[PDB]
Amino acid sequence: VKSGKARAHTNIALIKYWGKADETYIIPMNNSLSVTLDRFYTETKVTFDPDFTEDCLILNGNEVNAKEKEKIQNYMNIVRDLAGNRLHARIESENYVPTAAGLASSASAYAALAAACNEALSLNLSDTDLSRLARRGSGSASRSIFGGFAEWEKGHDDLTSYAHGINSNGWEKDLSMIFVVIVSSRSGMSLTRDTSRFYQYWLDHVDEDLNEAKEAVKNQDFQRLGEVIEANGLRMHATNLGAQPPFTYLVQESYDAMAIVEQCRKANLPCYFTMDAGPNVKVLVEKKNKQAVMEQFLKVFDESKIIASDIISSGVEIIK
Amino acid sequence: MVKSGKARAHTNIALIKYWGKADETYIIPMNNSLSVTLDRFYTETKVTFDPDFTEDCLILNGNEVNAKEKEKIQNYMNIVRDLAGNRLHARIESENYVPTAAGLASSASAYAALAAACNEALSLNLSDTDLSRLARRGSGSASRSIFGGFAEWEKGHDDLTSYAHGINSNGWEKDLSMIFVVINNQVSSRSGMSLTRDTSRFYQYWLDHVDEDLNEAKEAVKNQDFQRLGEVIEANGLRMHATNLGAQPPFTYLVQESYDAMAIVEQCRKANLPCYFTMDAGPNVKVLVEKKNKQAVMEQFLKVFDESKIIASDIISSGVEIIK
Numbered sequence: 314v315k316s317g318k319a320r321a322h323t324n325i326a327l328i329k330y331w332g333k334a335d336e337t338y339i340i341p342m343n344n345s346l347s348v349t350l351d352r353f354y355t356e357t358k359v360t361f362d363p364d365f366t367e368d369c370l371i372l373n374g375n376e377v378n379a380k381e382k383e384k385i386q387n388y389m390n391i392v393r394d395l396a397g398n399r400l401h402a403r404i405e406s407e408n409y410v411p412t413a414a415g416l417a418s419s420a421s422a423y424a425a426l427a428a429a430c431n432e433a434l435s436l437n438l439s440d441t442d443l444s445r446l447a448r449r450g451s452g453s454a455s456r457s458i459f460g461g462f463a464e465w466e467k468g469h470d471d472l473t474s475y476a477h478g479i480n481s482n483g484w485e486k487d488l489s490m491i492f493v494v495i496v497s498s499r500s501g502m503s504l505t506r507d508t509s510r511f512y513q514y515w516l517d518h519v520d521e522d523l524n525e526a527k528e529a530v531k532n533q534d535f536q537r538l539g540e541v542i543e544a545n546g547l548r549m550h551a552t553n554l555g556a557q558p559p560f561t562y563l564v565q566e567s568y569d570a571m572a573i574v575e576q577c578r579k580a581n582l583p584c585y586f587t588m589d590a591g592p593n594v595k596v597l598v599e600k601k602n603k604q605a606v607m608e609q610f611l612k613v614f615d616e617s618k619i620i621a622s623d624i625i626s627s628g629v630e631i632i633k
Numbered sequence: 634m635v636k637s638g639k640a641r642a643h644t645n646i647a648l649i650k651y652w653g654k655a656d657e658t659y660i661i662p663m664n665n666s667l668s669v670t671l672d673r674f675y676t677e678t679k680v681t682f683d684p685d686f687t688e689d690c691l692i693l694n695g696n697e698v699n700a701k702e703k704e705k706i707q708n709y710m711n712i713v714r715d716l717a718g719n720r721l722h723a724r725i726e727s728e729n730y731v732p733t734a735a736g737l738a739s740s741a742s743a744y745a746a747l748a749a750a751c752n753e754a755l756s757l758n759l760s761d762t763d764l765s766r767l768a769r770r771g772s773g774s775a776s777r778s779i780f781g782g783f784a785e786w787e788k789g790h791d792d793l794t795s796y797a798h799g800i801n802s803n804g805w806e807k808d809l810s811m812i813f814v815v816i817n818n819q820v821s822s823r824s825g826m827s828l829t830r831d832t833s834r835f836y837q838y839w840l841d842h843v844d845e846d847l848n849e850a851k852e853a854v855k856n857q858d859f860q861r862l863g864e865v866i867e868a869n870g871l872r873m874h875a876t877n878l879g880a881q882p883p884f885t886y887l888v889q890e891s892y893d894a895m896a897i898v899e900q901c902r903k904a905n906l907p908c909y910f911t912m913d914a915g916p917n918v919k920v921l922v923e924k925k926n927k928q929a930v931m932e933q934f935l936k937v938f939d940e941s942k943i944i945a946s947d948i949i950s951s952g953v954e955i956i957k
């Protein structure tokens with residue numbers, strides 16, 4: 314029997330991945346830039362047994378659903394081909410995330426599975442190839458191989474499409490993210506990629522957004538990073554508005570949280586917001602101002618709905 | 634002695650959006666717009682000028698308006714007094730036959746009816762152009778209400794040059810209709826567009842496409858090409874709402890139900906009922922459809938929406954009118 318266990322942390326995209334150039338290999342229409350979070354993660358143990366008939370995934374103690382079981386089986390097929398065996402695996406996975414709060418486990422789940430498999434089957438994959446393996450499960454997972462800032466290079470094929478870690482001289486140690494708890498990303502983004510009247514607008518600005526953001530981290534320039542990523546995040550959501558037919562991930566409460574962020578800026582508490590495939594609002598903020606910003610939120614939201622996390626420096630990690 | 638006049642003006646809905654002012658004081662817009670004038674919804678406004686009157690008075694649907702609206706209306710009438718070269722104050726009696734509680738706007742038809750009423754009362758002999766200009770000062774969209782069918786508001790660059798005109802459609806307005814999906818709300822158009830215009834990160838994007846949209850739209854009506862019209866106006870409308878998303882801080886007029894309404898429109902398209910939607914400063918979804926499909930399209934909506942929430946109107950051919 315072959316087993317291994319690993320922990321991967323979720324990451325939030327500051328420059329968004331939204332829309333695939335290639336649905337089967339998960340190659341993106343554009344590069345993305347993300348930060349990896351300390352607080353939320355997945356621990357996954359994988360066990361390969363000559364005895365097993367089909368792949369098993371137990372998550373937080375409970376067997377998973379149809380589509381997920383199928384989603385896992387097709388993914389392990391990839392792992393089997395790569396490793397060169399025919400072993401089925403029993404996967405035991407736990408998400409360390411506030412429950413029923415809508416946090417995406419996608420990135421942390423596949424990065425963790427990829428790394429656990431790597432360990433179990435002794436593949437000694439390089440980070441590049443680990444990121445590649447993770448990508449095949451979920452595009453965002455490619456980034457969770459790394460800590461701090463990470464960039465997913467879109468490439469043009471399976472070999473060239475992967476993430477890498479960005480050294481920012483420890484800037485990530487100065488930063489945090491506040492979550493305000495309030496249609497599938499894969500399904501949402503394919504509709505928008507395929508049909509949206511505003512998608513071209515998204516493509517025309519994404520590289521510049523990205524360049525500006527990467528420059529800002531080179532200078533550890535928070536306001537400048539913050540401004541571009543906020544703009545970029547909003548433009549992603551604009552594209553869904555142009556889909557055929559239109560849709561939104563946002564609700565009034567998301568807008569209320571956004572308004573609170575602008576006010577914090579006016580009161581000289583720099584922070585910037587972004588949203589993914591749901592109404593949750595994430596507030597990038599400097600650690601020094603994290604408590605102050607949270608207080609401003611507490612005036613309006615339940616304390617239980619205001620959850621802060623640091624940015625973790627290290628990457629995916631083997632659990633011995 | 635006593636000078637009175639009474640007018641009926643119909644509301645209009647924009648297919649190409651006015652959204653954002655170049656001049657807040659005189660209400661000169663950042664771009665041209667194109668609308669259609671609704672047969673079913675209108676305002677009737679009577680104005681009576683009397684030397685004895687010492688202050689303008691406004692009665693709306695039989696009721697006091699309040700010192701706020703009262704003050705606002707007197708400011709507007711000053712414009713009329715300056716225009717007429719008199720100092721006569723007016724008693725204004727107005728009835729809105731517009732589902733305002735249901736969220737439809739009354740300001741376009743209200744200000745158009747008032748402009749026309751004063752012109753009739755005072756015998757100003759204003760051209761439709763000057764009527765449009767007078768209406769515009771009260772509310773931009775009111776400039777278009779002077780006219781029936783398809784109308785366009787030319788933005789101009791000053792108070793003399795910004796006004797609307799009626800577009801001759803070869804009677805195409807008679808083939809069209811508009812379904813209103815009243816959606817459970819619940820930020821003014823003037824204040825909203827101002828925040829967006831001043832502030833929105835996506836406003837330039839709106840500006841870079843509006844003229845092309847408008848030219849395509851007008852070319853579409855020249856040809857009575859309903860699909861060509863519907864497609865561009867629907868994209869225009871959506872782009873207008875995108876800009877709000879970019880404002881500092883962002884906001885939307887749209888709620889989940891609005892999105893549900895758009896979805897049904899798209900199903901209607903796939904199912905051979907051509908129609909297209911647009912939304913204004915509220916979650917209500919308006920559905921441009923050909924008169925011959927009005928009923929079929931309403932029934933698709935009637936599968937999910939309360940019957941009282943689905944209201945259709947034809948498009949009127951004629952413009953603002955003087956009545957008894």
Ligand SMILES: O=C(O)C[C@@](O)(CF)CCOP(=O)(O)OP(=O)(O)O
Binds near residue numbers: 328330339345452
């Ligand atoms: O994370 C980002 O860059 C942006 C988003 O989070 C915004 F919602 C999308 C994530 O995409 P994902 O869940 O990875 O899709 P998959 O490849 O189809 O599994």
Ligand SMILES: O=C(O)C[C@@](O)(CF)CCOP(=O)(O)OP(=O)(O)O
Binds near residue numbers: 651652666775822
């Ligand atoms: O009708 C349109 O062109 C589009 C809108 O309806 C979309 F909400 C805006 C109307 O603006 P309006 O109320 O006329 O503004 P005012 O000049 O500040 O009174």
